[PDB]
Structure prediction request, 624 residues.
Amino acid sequence: QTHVQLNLNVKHKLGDVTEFNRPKFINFHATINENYWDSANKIADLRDDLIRKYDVYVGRETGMIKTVLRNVKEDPERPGFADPDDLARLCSQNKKRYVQNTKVHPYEKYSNLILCNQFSPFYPDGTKTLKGWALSQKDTEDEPFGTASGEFYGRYIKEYFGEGGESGEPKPGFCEVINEPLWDIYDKPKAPKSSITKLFEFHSTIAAQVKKFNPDMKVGGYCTAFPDFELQNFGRWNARWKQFIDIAGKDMDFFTIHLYDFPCKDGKQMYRKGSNMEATMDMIEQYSMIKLGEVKPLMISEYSAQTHDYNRKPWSPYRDWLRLKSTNSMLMQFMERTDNICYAMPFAMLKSEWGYNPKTGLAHTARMLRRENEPESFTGEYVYSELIKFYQLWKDVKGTRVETNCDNPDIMCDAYVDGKNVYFIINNLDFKPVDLNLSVNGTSKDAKSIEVRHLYLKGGKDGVPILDVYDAKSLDHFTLETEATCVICYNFDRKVKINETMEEVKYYATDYLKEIAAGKELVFNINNVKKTEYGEAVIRLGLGRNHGLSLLPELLVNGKKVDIPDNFRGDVQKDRASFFGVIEVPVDYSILKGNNTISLKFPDNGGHVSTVTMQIFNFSNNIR
Ligand SMILES: OC[C@H]1O[C@@H](O)[C@H](O)[C@@H](O[C@@H]2O[C@H]3CO[C@@H]([C@@H]2O)[C@@H]3O)[C@H]1O
Ligand SMILES: OC[C@H]1O[C@@H](O[C@H]2[C@H]3OC[C@@H]2O[C@@H](O)[C@H]3O)[C@H](O)[C@@H](O)[C@H]1O
Ligand SMILES: [Ca+2]
Ligand SMILES: [Ca+2]
Ligand SMILES: [Ca+2]
Prediction:
């Protein structure tokens, strides 16, 4: 059994973040003004049900800007530039439409828009628009590559957006440069395999042009389709994200990636959830520290699962479950880094009827709504898909973060206190049910009530997701289902008193990315660590090694032996080509000091230590 402990009087502080951020986390890939809200739905006022009742935020949109780019006339004075007058005209037409759409204006308080360009025709590779012209491909001193694309983007933002309501749509919170560019440039079938670093320079040019027209706008990149750092023995890291940080890092306000699990690609299960995405995110942060001297805010503008083996099938509840389980796990992991995550958006769109292909009968694979007669036919009014269960599960969750601990790296836990209510969230990374023994410490009173919410799969493969919601007189034990999530809601007679603090600080090494040779000591240094009287600590070993190679180095911390656990967060990565993941190693707090030496010795040759980082948890008093 796994012991899960909730210390509800102990605030968990990370940087200056102490509270659950619903807009940052409980959101989806939509806008308040898409016309799909307003027709063909069983629920008459769908915004009120989805946005208001469930308290769900938006969003991200690429289609409006694409339509303007693809239809704008060319500047007669400057070949390869959008005409400023026609651009203003098209933007004005759209702005007028927004201004007249008064029913959506009260929902602006739920919206912080991520704007982004689709790859084509924004990337200036010669692709022509519907008006028969291509964005300038020049790369001169006065017209660096992407100048015309950048000017288009900057002018679009300036011309279309207003200050809310009758003044126009509020400005975006964040401007991503370009969606999944290296997928199109390098990796897709029949990709041209043009210059990778040219794309990175393009980001600097775009940022400068956007900020010429819109000085306060945050710009980011590179919006990576598949951040797969270990590939080609870390050659992929060295050619891509390393270079992007080196070239454009100083010019970006935020970094942005996409994170998709592959639960079923030609019958293989290749997950990021668990230790793999920890390694990806640690490598971005660690190298940012080395090169830039700071961690850059990270956006995850799309995440969950891509379901290859089900993507030529019609809709099913099971396909939605594949997405749900990835979303819940990834979300917990992003919550653990809330101080350095600026936005994380599960990839679920509202309706995307544009994505329905009448040739094949295939609807879009990530929708909040589906037609009543699906999967048999794409007919009938729209009703919620199973993805609504995510928003049902997370309903109400807010408040001050408090300390949890669970003694199984495959179980993730978190908790938030909102007055009299406490939300205790537990997620399973294991592929079997896990029996939990629950302890709630820090109050003298029993809860007045307990509501259990449990999201799991019934009936195995091709089964259905179930959201069980029930009241419990007590909850000392609970079986969490395979890859399942529960949210346990405790309600107390009076407001819960939070009277202690646990402050988490994450420290980075002076170096990274070291090759492993058998019996050869690798030495890392983590310095200026601040200790208090009482604390705990975790060393985070990012390892990228072929299968068959040891994940159990000899570890010395300040000359003292520290044991490495057999179990780490998530799966052993069997169907992946190699192992890439962070092994989390608890370390006795008394071994640590301000300047620390971490030594690793492996028994075999090959692979790399990608990163060594450390989390310190400092307590206000002797809370253990
Ligand atoms: O990298 C593996 C690929 O497998 C293919 O079977 C799949 O079609 C392909 O999907 C693509 O993935 C991202 C890049 O472009 C979109 C497309 O669906 C998506 O954003 C990819 O998964
Ligand atoms: O494919 C054209 C449509 O794309 C929609 O947005 C998509 C694209 O960017 C976000 C979202 O998903 C990605 O995979 C991209 O393909 C857009 O909303 C529509 O109006 C069309 O442009
Ligand atoms: Ca990409
Ligand atoms: Ca990559
Ligand atoms: Ca494990």
